[PDB]
RNA sequence: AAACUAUGCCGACUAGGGAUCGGGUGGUGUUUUUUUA
């Protein structure tokens, strides 16, 4: 079923993780009619700075409301069978430019298509299933900013040892440098 | 040469001449004027409201 | 009690000081300008 | 009622300093109150402040010592050329090289040296000493 | 004498303007309309 | 709490039974 | 010390070694006097950490309630220290257990600014916000003296 | 500071900083939009709606389990009113007191407060003409009054 | 890894704490 | 109590505090689960509900309401989240 | 003193320990 | 018929202390009472 979980998207590592997505339907009883309707768009292998690797999996939006319902242990098994990685489930959504002072007739700017928007959903998506808390921004007296993300306590050991992944991967992802943090 | 006091410094700071510029505007010659140790005293003992004047008293061309 | 309330230097000799700040009337830029 | 976002956010410091604090609580923010904010913070009158984000519109926390004289707002915001940021400084400091005039120039928020510098001008937001 | 039921109220200037129903046209076209009604009434 | 006159569609409904 | 602490050296004109628990800026330092090898440095995050040199690593860190100006170790017992408080107090912690504080000095009405110690480890300083410098012994918990 | 009166009160709601479904939530978005329009076909406000939404059926706040807010689906499935509810309420109370007159024409307490009530009726008025979802030539009175809330 | 580096610190404690044990002595 | 910071406040003073003078406004009411013995069927109520909520299979009153927190009825068997 | 007549559970904080919000390194 | 010994610096305002009036939350036992209010 490699053509047939993907979305015009003809890449190896995607063959990969679809056939693996095989294996987790016809070994299981019922999550094989519980991910059937829901294929996915792109995939992405990303290494941290310290070496380590995680998946990233573009997705459209209903398909992730699906996912969204039946992640946890679609990335526990999905953990077991790239050993050694980080899974992560993400949108790809789209952004719209600012229509310049010379510029013919486009749409107004939804601003949940503004990009900031974006961003943020991209921080929501990326962390869960734990929520985040808070955001502060710590102006430094050489004007350094430090962007921070309070999450929650309540999967603390869950999360504990994915924060450094997460820093990368957002980083390559939008071009910020960002640190989370979990008020214990 | 020319003693300065206290007063004369908080008026020039509330009528905004310096104080080189303006003293030699008005002897037309060349002003080295002093503060003595008990008028910087006072100015100190002055103390939290009038400390941008002490600010301007504290300068390098007021020997 | 009966000696009055000792006010500081007062600087910014252009304009009114209320709570917007800053009021400064057109005469004045005139003036100064 | 409420007189500006600007203005009480600058009346704030300019109480929690005179009656001697270290951190103010400064609510609503605006990206004109981060940039005054970072001026006055580059050019050493403030310590540093931290960005509070809340969804409704986030407060800022500052820590200051003890170097702030007064900071305040100009409400009618007028033209000036260069030679105008010269008698202006003059008018409105306490002398001449003491205190910055804060200007908002077509090259972003900045004050009146770093304007006669880069050779720009503009309007006038406020002023620090 | 005495009534219980209180006198109108005299409308906004604003109101006023709606009330022409000048509020929702162009500058150009709340100029030629002003010039309209200053003629009628002279 | 049934507010019978409140929308659009109750007061067409109001206006036909005047009719 | 900085954003991140950096150890340098006098011949060598980059920085050395950075060492830094995370990405929290660092506003004072002091190597201590006996084991020099021992650094403890403030955080503007309200906390203290504490690092070796000879393992080139932090090595403890203990989060407190306000945020703390100055500290200070002593010079005739090489595990004690002292941190100037903005809670308007001093503390005199052990280096073994942070659980507790051995003292805590307790008579400004502002924020501590900084803290010295006298050099026969007998004594203590602190400068304050409020105009005024209290003196204390490292016994009492109380002031000695004002100025 | 609460206008036309002195009180100087703070009382409302807090909203939380999340803004996503709560774990808890078992419920699709289509059956709780089909429940809001089963409720606005019985009858009741937005504001009531909301109100029954969280108490009986645990809808937190619709405007983050649904993307659109009530009356945005009201609007979108044909149930719009003519009036806003906060204008079509104070005209309600205004009727209400200038009937109590008619039957009492000694209360001047009731007189000036309808004074205040028109006044705050003119304002919400000229604001909601303004943003035109009402009519430029709206006019409140008696008849008006009388004719649309009975 | 993070957690890692947690331990290193808690083993690099233990060692400073006995040389400034000496000390106590 | 005596003094303290105002970006870390301590989590007990930011829940002695009011629910709009904390750092981050957030509610302080909470959702409960009961399970009303005419049919042992559970439902949500707010646990600061204005009104008398009702089960849906058995027109049985869980929760009356009285100024600030709903009373709920005697046998209904309740528990948080 | 008049929340220790009335409460159940309160325990008596020292005032060497008042102003600990915590450690990393934890002890036995 | 009224008035007839009253008089307090103010403000864009910092911490508060004992009270008390109205509402709410929690703890805690006395006073209460219990399938009928
Ligand atoms: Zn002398
Ligand atoms: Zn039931």
Known sequence: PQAKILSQAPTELELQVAQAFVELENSSPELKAELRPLQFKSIREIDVAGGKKALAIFVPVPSLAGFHKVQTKLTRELEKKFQDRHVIFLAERRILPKPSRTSRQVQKRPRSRTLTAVHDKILEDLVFPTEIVGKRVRYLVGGNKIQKVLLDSKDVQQIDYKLESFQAVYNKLTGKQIVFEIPS | ?63 | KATKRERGLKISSVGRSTRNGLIVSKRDIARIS | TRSSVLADALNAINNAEKTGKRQVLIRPSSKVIIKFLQVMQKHGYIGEFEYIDDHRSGKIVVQLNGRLNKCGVISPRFNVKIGDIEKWTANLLPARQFGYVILTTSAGIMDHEEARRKHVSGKILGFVY | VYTPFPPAQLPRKVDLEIESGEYFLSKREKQMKKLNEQKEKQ | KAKKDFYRFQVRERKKQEI | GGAKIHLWDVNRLKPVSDLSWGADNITSLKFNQNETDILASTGSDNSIVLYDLRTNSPTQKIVQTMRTNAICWNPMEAFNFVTANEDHNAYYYDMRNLSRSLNVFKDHVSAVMDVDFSPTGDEIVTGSYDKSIRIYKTNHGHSREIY | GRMHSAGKGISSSAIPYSRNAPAWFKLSSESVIEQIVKYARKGLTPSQIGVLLRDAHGVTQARVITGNKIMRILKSNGLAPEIPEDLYYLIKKAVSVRKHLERNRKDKDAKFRLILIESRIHRLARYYRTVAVLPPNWKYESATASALVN | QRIQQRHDRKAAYEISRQEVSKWND | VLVQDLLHPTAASEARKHKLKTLVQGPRSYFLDVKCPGCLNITTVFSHAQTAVTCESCSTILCTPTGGKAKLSEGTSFRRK | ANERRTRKDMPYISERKKQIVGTVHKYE
Do not use: H, W
């Open chain 2, 1 to 63: 040469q020319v003693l300065i006091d206290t007063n004369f410094i908080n008026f020039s700071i509330q009528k905004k001449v310096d104080i080189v510029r303006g003293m030699m505007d008005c002897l037309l010659a060349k002003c080295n004027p002093l503060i003595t140790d008990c008028v910087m005293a006072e100015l100190e003992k002055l103390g939290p409201k009038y400390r941008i004047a002490l600010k301007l008293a504290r300068d390098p061309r007021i020997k």
